[PDB]
DNA sequence: TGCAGGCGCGCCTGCA
DNA sequence: TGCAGGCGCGCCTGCA
């Protein structure tokens, strides 16, 4: 199973309840990418950490949030936290790479959730 | 024994040598907190993971490091790694909570080693 | 520069 | 209370 394989790349140490949620977050993404034929690209990006992979997109919601098992969050934040930065606190800490065509900030009909298309930046000035 | 009970809360999977070191690190802290009457507060913070605990302090050294059984480290890093984040890289990955009065960064005469007074952050950009 | 690690005096413990 | 021996904080050297 691709879900168990992708979960093997998950960052951080989660408790029982948190583990179950992360699994639902991976299952949710896997179901979407399977329908659009982008599943192999996610496997490639996650297992190899290759920045030069294609955008991995999902439809953007009206308010930008994604709900997974009764919890809402920004999808690029969810998947960047899951596979790269477990202590990432917000989207203000993320900036998309130059080659990202569907970066969250662009506010297109599709949002790129490829964690290797984002970089961490300094928290904005007050 | 408070040492055995606090060790039961240790994070990660340690080999024989590391287990013995972790025990010395808990024994070292327990001896200091007993002398300043803070042992019950450590027990409360560790066993209940309660952020709403008092600061748990030890005297700060000239260079900030603490030596336990021939190994030196920043004491808030040592105790946060032990009870919260076993892969904690450095003090650059820890920020103290707003209510921490003796946070390591404050460089006061006393340093807070309450792991629930710190939050783990990604390495500064 | 920060930071890691070698080394010893001073403090401590456990025997006399 | 003399004395032996363990260990850490402070001082130091050297590396990234
Ligand atoms: Zn992209
Ligand atoms: Zn504190």
Numbering used by the authors:
A (entry chain B): 10 to 135
B (entry chain A): 10 to 134
From the paper:
Smad proteins consist of an N-terminal MH1 domain, which binds to DNA, a linker region with phosphorylation sites for network regulatory inputs, and a C-terminal MH2 domain that is phosphorylated by the receptors and binds other Smad proteins, LDTFs, chromatin readers, and transcriptional co-activators and co-repressors. The receptors for TGF-β, nodal, activin, myostatin, and other family members are membrane serine/threonine kinases that phosphorylate and activate Smad2 and Smad3, whereas analogous receptors for the bone morphogenetic proteins (BMPs) preferentially phosphorylate and activate Smads 1, 5, and 8. These receptor-activated Smads (R-Smads) form heterotrimeric complexes with Smad4, which is required for the transcriptional regulation of most target genes. Focusing on the human and mouse Gsc promoter, here we identify specific Smad-binding GC-rich motifs and provide the X-ray crystal structures of Smad3 and Smad4 bound to several of these motifs. The structures determined here reveal that the β-hairpin is flexible and adaptable to bind with high-affinity several variants of the consensus sequence GGC(GC)|(CG), which we refer to as 5GC SBE.
Next, we investigated the binding mode of the Smad3 MH1 domain with the GGCGC motif. Crystals of human Smad3 MH1 domain bound to a 16mer dsDNA oligonucleotide containing the GGCGCG motif yielded data at 2.05 Å resolution using synchrotron radiation (I41 symmetry ID29, ESRF, Grenoble), which together with the Smad4 bound to the same site, are the highest-resolution structures determined for a DNA-bound Smad MH1 domain to date. The asymmetric unit (ASU) of the complex contains two Smad3 monomers and one dsDNA. The guanidine group of Arg74 is well ordered due to its tight coordination by the G5 nucleotide (fitting of the side chains to the density are shown in Fig. 4i). The Lys81 side chain is also well defined, through hydrogen bond interactions from the ɛ-amino group to the pair of nucleotides G6 and G10′ (in the complementary chain) and with several well-ordered water molecules in the proximity of the ɛ-amino group. The Gln76 side chain carbonyl interacts with N3 of C9′, and also with C7, G8, and G8′ mediated by the presence of several tightly bound water molecules. Various interactions occurred between Leu71, Gln76, Ser78, His79, and His101 backbone and the DNA phosphates. In fact, Smad3 and Smad4 GGCGC complexes are structurally very similar with a Cα RMSD of 0.44 Å for 105 aligned residues and both complexes interact directly with the DNA using the β2–β3 hairpin.
